[PDB]
Amino acid sequence: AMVTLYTTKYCPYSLRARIALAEKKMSTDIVEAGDLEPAMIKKITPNGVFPVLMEKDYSINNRKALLIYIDERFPAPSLLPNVVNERIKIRLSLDKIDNEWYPVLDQIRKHRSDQKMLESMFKDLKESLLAMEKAFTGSEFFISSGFTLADCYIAALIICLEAEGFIIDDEYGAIYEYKKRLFARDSVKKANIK
Amino acid sequence: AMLLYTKKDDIYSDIVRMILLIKGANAKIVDVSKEENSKHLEELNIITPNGNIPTLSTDDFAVYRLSVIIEAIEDLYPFPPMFPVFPKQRANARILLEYVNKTFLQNIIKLQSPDLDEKQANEIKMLMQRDIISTYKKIVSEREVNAESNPDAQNINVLTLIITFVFYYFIKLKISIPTKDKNIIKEIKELLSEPNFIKTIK
Numbered sequence: 001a002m003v004t005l006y007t008t009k010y011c012p013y014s015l016r017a018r019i020a021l022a023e024k025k026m027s028t029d030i031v032e033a034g035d036l037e038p039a040m041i042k043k044i045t046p047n048g049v050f051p052v053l054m055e056k057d058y059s060i061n062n063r064k065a066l067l068i069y070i071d072e073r074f075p076a077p078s079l080l081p082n083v084v085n086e087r088i089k090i091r092l093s094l095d096k097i098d099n100e101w102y103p104v105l106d107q108i109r110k111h112r113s114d115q116k117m118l119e120s121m122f123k124d125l126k127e128s129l130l131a132m133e134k135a136f137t138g139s140e141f142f143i144s145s146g147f148t149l150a151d152c153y154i155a156a157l158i159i160c161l162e163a164e165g166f167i168i169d170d171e172y173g174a175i176y177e178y179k180k181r182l183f184a185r186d187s188v189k190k191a192n193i194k
Numbered sequence: 195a196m197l198l199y200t201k202k203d204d205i206y207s208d209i210v211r212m213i214l215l216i217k218g219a220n221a222k223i224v225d226v227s228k229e230e231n232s233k234h235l236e237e238l239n240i241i242t243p244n245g246n247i248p249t250l251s252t253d254d255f256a257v258y259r260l261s262v263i264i265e266a267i268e269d270l271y272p273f274p275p276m277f278p279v280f281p282k283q284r285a286n287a288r289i290l291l292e293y294v295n296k297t298f299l300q301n302i303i304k305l306q307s308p309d310l311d312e313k314q315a316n317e318i319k320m321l322m323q324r325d326i327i328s329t330y331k332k333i334v335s336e337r338e339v340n341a342e343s344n345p346d347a348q349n350i351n352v353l354t355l356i357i358t359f360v361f362y363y364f365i366k367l368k369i370s371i372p373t374k375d376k377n378i379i380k381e382i383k384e385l386l387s388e389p390n391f392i393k394t395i396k
């Protein structure tokens with residue numbers, strides 16, 4: 001009731017924010033936009049960018065800054081590794097996921113009407129995942145001991161790729177096990193139901 | 195154990211070198227453009243996808259994007275604090291840093307390409323002149339806000355630092371700073387006269 005997150009359906013930035021807020025056990029309440037008038041929508045976020053986290057008179061919708069703000073605004077439990085060197089590599093992974101993997105989801109959405117262009121995009125995305133299957137071996141979550149923001153980034157990316165028709169199944173190996181572990185977690189599956 | 199891969203006249207390299215200087219860190223600065231350090235150049239393309247400059251490398255990691263490097267330096271050297279103290283201000287500092295990078299920093303880099311058209315280079319310069327003063331005023335305001343929230347605290351305002359090199363490379367690239375405001379001119383001269391900045395540009 002104190003803080004409110006305004007979300008959009010099928011948006012990975014909205015999904016990974018709900019996963020992160022749930023991991024924080026914050027008293028914030030989710031409010032699905034689209035159910036609100038443009039008079040309210042244009043007042044929530046002036047530039048119409050979702051998701052939007054607001055409390056009091058502050059309001060943040062910057063994509064690359066939202067979850068970092070979430071983890072710092074509600075500090076416990078920490079969503080970054082405690083060891084400095086692991087945290088530095090997680091920060092680089094977050095930048096690589098936002099700049100090199102989320103655009104793959106973006107182009108799959110934009111050209112989903114073209115079946116032949118879609119089949120090739122799914123084919124290149126499978127080869128990309130299978131190439132880094134070794135990086136998912138020997139860790140309960142993504143290259144870390146515990147649940148981090150990277151697991152939030154990846155979960156929302158898998159949920160949205162699943163809706164587009166891209167499924168991670170038995171053939172991905174350690175990636176598939178990590179996915180099964182990832183979706184077993186309460187915050188991920190609370191946001192995955194639809 | 196910490197190594198910083200560097201290129202001459204790279205504005206990202208000069209920013210990071212001034213940051214490492216303030217935090218009291220002692221990293222090995224390697225100008226990769228020089229022929230003597232060509233053995234390090236071979237090492238860089240191994241640990242980075244595109245021989246990224248600059249790159250902060252230790253025995254454990256190798257990071258290369260400016261926002262990531264600044265965040266990593268803040269983990270390795272907490273003193274003095276890099277960002278503001280409150281979370282909304284810290285988020286605002288990261289949004290503004292993303293903006294200064296998109297419109298100024300990587301356009302300063304594009305102007306160093308050798309195959310640029312005259313009209314192309316002039317549009318890049320004119321577009322930065324269009325927003326430089328407006329950007330500088332936001333940085334001063336956001337710096338005055340954080341000072342109000344914490345007078346005792348003394349963090350290195352990283353945006354004021356980065357904007358100092360924007361002005362320095364403005365001067366290097368013969369781009370004029372479009373303002374007749376004698377106060378703004380007085381402050382830009384004072385930014386360029388900070389001792390840590392003077393030590394960085396040799």
Ligand code: PRO
Nearest residue numbers: 206247258259260261
């Ligand atoms: O935008 C960045 O952060 C990277 C740094 C080197 C050039 N591009």
